[PDB]
Amino acid sequence: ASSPANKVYQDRFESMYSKIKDPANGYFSEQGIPYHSIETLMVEAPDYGHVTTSEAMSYYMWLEAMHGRFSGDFTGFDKSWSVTEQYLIPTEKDQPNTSMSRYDANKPATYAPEFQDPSKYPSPLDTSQPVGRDPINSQLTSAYGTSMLYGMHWILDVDNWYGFGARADGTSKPSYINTFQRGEQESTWETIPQPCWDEHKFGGQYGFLDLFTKDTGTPAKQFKYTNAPDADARAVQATYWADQWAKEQGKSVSTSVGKATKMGDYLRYSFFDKYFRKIGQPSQAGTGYDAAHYLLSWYYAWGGGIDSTWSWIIGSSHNHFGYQNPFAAWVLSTDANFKPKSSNGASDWAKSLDRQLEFYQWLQSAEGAIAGGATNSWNGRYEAVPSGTSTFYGMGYVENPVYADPGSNTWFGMQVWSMQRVAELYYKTGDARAKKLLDKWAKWINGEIKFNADGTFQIPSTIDWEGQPDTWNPTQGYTGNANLHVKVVNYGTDLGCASSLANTLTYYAAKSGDETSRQNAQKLLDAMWNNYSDSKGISTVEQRGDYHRFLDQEVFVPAGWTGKMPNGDVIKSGVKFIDIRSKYKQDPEWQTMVAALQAGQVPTQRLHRFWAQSEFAVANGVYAILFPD
Ligand SMILES: OC[C@H]1O[C@@H](O[C@H]2[C@H](O)[C@@H](O)[C@H](S[C@H]3[C@H](O)[C@@H](O)[C@H](Sc4ccc(I)cc4)O[C@@H]3CO)O[C@@H]2CO)[C@H](O)[C@@H](O)[C@@H]1O
Numbered sequence: 001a002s003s004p005a006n007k008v009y010q011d012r013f014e015s016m017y018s019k020i021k022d023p024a025n026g027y028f029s030e031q032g033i034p035y036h037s038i039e040t041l042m043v044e045a046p047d048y049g050h051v052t053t054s055e056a057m058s059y060y061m062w063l064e065a066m067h068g069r070f071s072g073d074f075t076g077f078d079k080s081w082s083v084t085e086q087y088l089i090p091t092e093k094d095q096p097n098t099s100m101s102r103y104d105a106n107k108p109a110t111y112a113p114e115f116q117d118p119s120k121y122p123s124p125l126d127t128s129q130p131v132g133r134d135p136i137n138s139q140l141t142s143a144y145g146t147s148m149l150y151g152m153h154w155i156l157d158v159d160n161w162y163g164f165g166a167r168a169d170g171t172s173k174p175s176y177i178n179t180f181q182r183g184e185q186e187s188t189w190e191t192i193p194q195p196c197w198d199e200h201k202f203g204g205q206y207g208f209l210d211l212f213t214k215d216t217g218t219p220a221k222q223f224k225y226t227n228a229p230d231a232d233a234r235a236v237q238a239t240y241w242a243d244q245w246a247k248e249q250g251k252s253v254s255t256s257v258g259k260a261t262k263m264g265d266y267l268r269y270s271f272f273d274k275y276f277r278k279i280g281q282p283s284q285a286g287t288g289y290d291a292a293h294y295l296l297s298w299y300y301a302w303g304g305g306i307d308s309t310w311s312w313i314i315g316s317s318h319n320h321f322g323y324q325n326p327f328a329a330w331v332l333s334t335d336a337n338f339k340p341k342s343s344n345g346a347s348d349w350a351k352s353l354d355r356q357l358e359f360y361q362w363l364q365s366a367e368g369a370i371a372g373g374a375t376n377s378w379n380g381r382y383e384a385v386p387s388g389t390s391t392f393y394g395m396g397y398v399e400n401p402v403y404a405d406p407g408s409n410t411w412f413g414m415q416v417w418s419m420q421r422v423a424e425l426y427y428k429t430g431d432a433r434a435k436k437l438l439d440k441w442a443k444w445i446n447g448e449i450k451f452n453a454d455g456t457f458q459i460p461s462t463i464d465w466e467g468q469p470d471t472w473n474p475t476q477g478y479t480g481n482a483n484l485h486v487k488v489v490n491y492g493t494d495l496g497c498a499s500s501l502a503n504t505l506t507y508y509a510a511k512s513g514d515e516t517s518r519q520n521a522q523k524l525l526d527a528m529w530n531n532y533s534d535s536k537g538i539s540t541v542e543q544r545g546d547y548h549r550f551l552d553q554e555v556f557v558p559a560g561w562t563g564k565m566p567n568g569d570v571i572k573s574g575v576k577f578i579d580i581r582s583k584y585k586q587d588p589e590w591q592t593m594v595a596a597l598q599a600g601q602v603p604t605q606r607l608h609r610f611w612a613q614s615e616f617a618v619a620n621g622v623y624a625i626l627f628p629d
């Protein structure tokens with residue numbers, strides 16, 4: 001039977017759980033899918049409050065697993081996995097096996113360059129540029145008897161707000177859509193949302209396809225899905241604890257474990273270079289695993305034809321430390337219950353485990369924070385690495401991977417999300433590499449937390465960097481990176497990050513005994529419970545400093561291109577963010593938002609992000625479990 005838990009904090013989790021699941025609060029859609037946030041006027045990662053992410057589903061699984069632990073009821077965790085497989089993992093209709101089975105592992109895809117500015121798109125396909133071999137496809141088709149991929153597509157238009165519908169019908173919900181397509185300078189604000197299933201029924205004469213990649217002839221009807229590695233890994237991580245807690249109570253989630261294991265098997269596609277080029281020697285085409293960096297890259301994606309059979313799959317050359325999950329790798333490589341069926345699944349994940357922890361240590365700054373990451377494709381075109389640039393296995397160090405507007409590693413969040421996984425690993429295995437990373441990182445963040453007399457508090461929000469880490473020498477190890485520094489630009493009261501911080505410090509303290517980490521984690525949880533609770537969970541007023549882009553941000557549309565969004569909005573050069581999303585004017589918060597801009601004030605909101613709420617609950621659960629008194 002499960003060990004006794006701290007009743008005070010267990011109660012707080014149960015409370016939050018009721019608030020999150022309460023139909024009156026509106027965190028879920030009528031199909032049981034969680035929204036990114038209750039409020040619809042939302043722009044940061046997705047550009048609409050009621051479009052969800054894989055990241056959300058994974059937090060949904062974590063919440064339900066924690067609920068099983070305290071109620072003995074795991075049916076909600078099982079339903080959490082049913083909704084995922086039904087709505088976020090493309091079905092047989094969404095990814096036609098007729099097309100996926102025509103896939104060729106020797107020529108996985110056609111090379112196309114990446115540009116530092118949205119106006120350089122569409123990018124031209126070049127069949128003369130080399131592409132390496134895919135070593136894991138035959139492992140996967142053979143173990144599962146299908147050519148379709150089993151991973152989650154990252155973003156979903158839950159209530160068909162954009163109008164694309166399901167597979168071009170325009171009326172079904174949920175709707176598979178995608179946003180980001182045009183480089184490091186394309187923010188949430190500069191995209192042109194498009195359907196995953198493109199039959200040319202919406203947009204331009206060829207749907208939205210020729211906005212992004214330019215081919216030699218007429219674009220074909222096609223589908224494409226993009227995975228968010230960090231969410232799939234988090235799904236595995238959460239499924240593991242659900243398995244642990246269920247067994248402790250004579251119950252089983254055997255079936256959910258099978259799904260999670262298959263997902264981790266396919267998740268290995270993120271270990272490869274975008275066009276399978278050798279790691280450390282980008283101009284040469286890969287021969288197999290020599291194109292594997294073994295890290296959880298920014299994505300892996302696949303697509304195929306709709307009215308003709310063919311398909312493609314790509315990895316990602318860009319690697320951010322915030323996506324890594326050392327715990328999920330430990331699980332899939334050492335736990336018999338999660339041993340992947342594919343021949344190399346488990347051992348590949350063992351290699352990822354060692355490589356991931358080297359990456360973290362390679363990026364640890366003088367102060368303790370973790371730097372961005374590295375890439376095997378400089379400027380996204382496999383260009384020459386400037387002399388002087390530090391490297392990790394041939395890959396060049398990049399301060400802000402994949403995005404520059406704003407930099408992907410300027411948000412404190414990446415710090416806690418990634419390191420929380422390193423804390424779970426250290427707690428369960430006492431691994432030495434994890435201890436070293438945590439002792440220094442934990443000391444940094446503990447001196448950066450501020451508690452005010454009135455009970456409120458602050459933690460880092462926006463951070464900045466200087467220098468670069470020393471070139472990684474595996475035999476030498478961590479030099480200390482004296483020339484790599486982190487600067488805290490400004491503080492804030494991000495309840496999600498505060499919660500994720502509490503979580504990280506709790507696991508670490510529970511293993512190391514660091515009293516400071518323990519009292520801070522608890523002060524944070526207490527602070528949020530006492531001063532930020534509300535009817536729907538927790539919240540605070542925050543400024544939305546980028547909302548002026550709602551009205552002043554120009555969206556690039558190529559010369560001569562004209563199209564329509566399902567609702568009729570015309571797409572042409574000159575349009576602004578709001579012009580191709582005119583429905584945003586019916587939002588309850590619209591007039592309030594615009595009035596503030598007109599009067600020259602930064603708008604403000606009291607937001608309820610689904611993941612932040614779950615993060616707060618889970619955090620309370622972790623504490624109740626590790627510190628029973
Ligand atoms: O059209 C006929 C040829 O198709 C080839 O396959 C290509 C597809 O046609 C094409 O649409 C896609 S475009 C693809 C981008 O290359 C990739 O960067 C991204 S995922 C992503 C994530 C973040 C950001 I910022 C930007 C992108 O996904 C895009 C699709 O959504 O590319 C494939 C191959 O590169 C066939 O290979 C060929 O046989 C056909 O002739």
Ligand SMILES: OC[C@H]1O[C@@H](O[C@H]2[C@H](O)[C@@H](O)[C@H](S[C@H]3[C@H](O)[C@@H](O)[C@H](Sc4ccc(I)cc4)O[C@@H]3CO)O[C@@H]2CO)[C@H](O)[C@@H](O)[C@@H]1O
Binds near residue numbers: 413461494497609
């Ligand atoms: O992609 C990563 C995840 O992002 C999550 O969303 C986070 C944003 O990415 C992050 O930028 C913001 S931090 C943001 C504050 O919320 C805002 O109040 C301030 S406004 C300000 C104030 C003073 C001054 I001087 C200048 C500006 O601006 C900050 C950014 O600069 O936090 C959100 C939520 O944590 C997504 O929720 C998640 O899905 C993504 O994975």
Ligand SMILES: [Ca+2]
Binds near residue numbers: 190
């Ligand atoms: Ca930009």
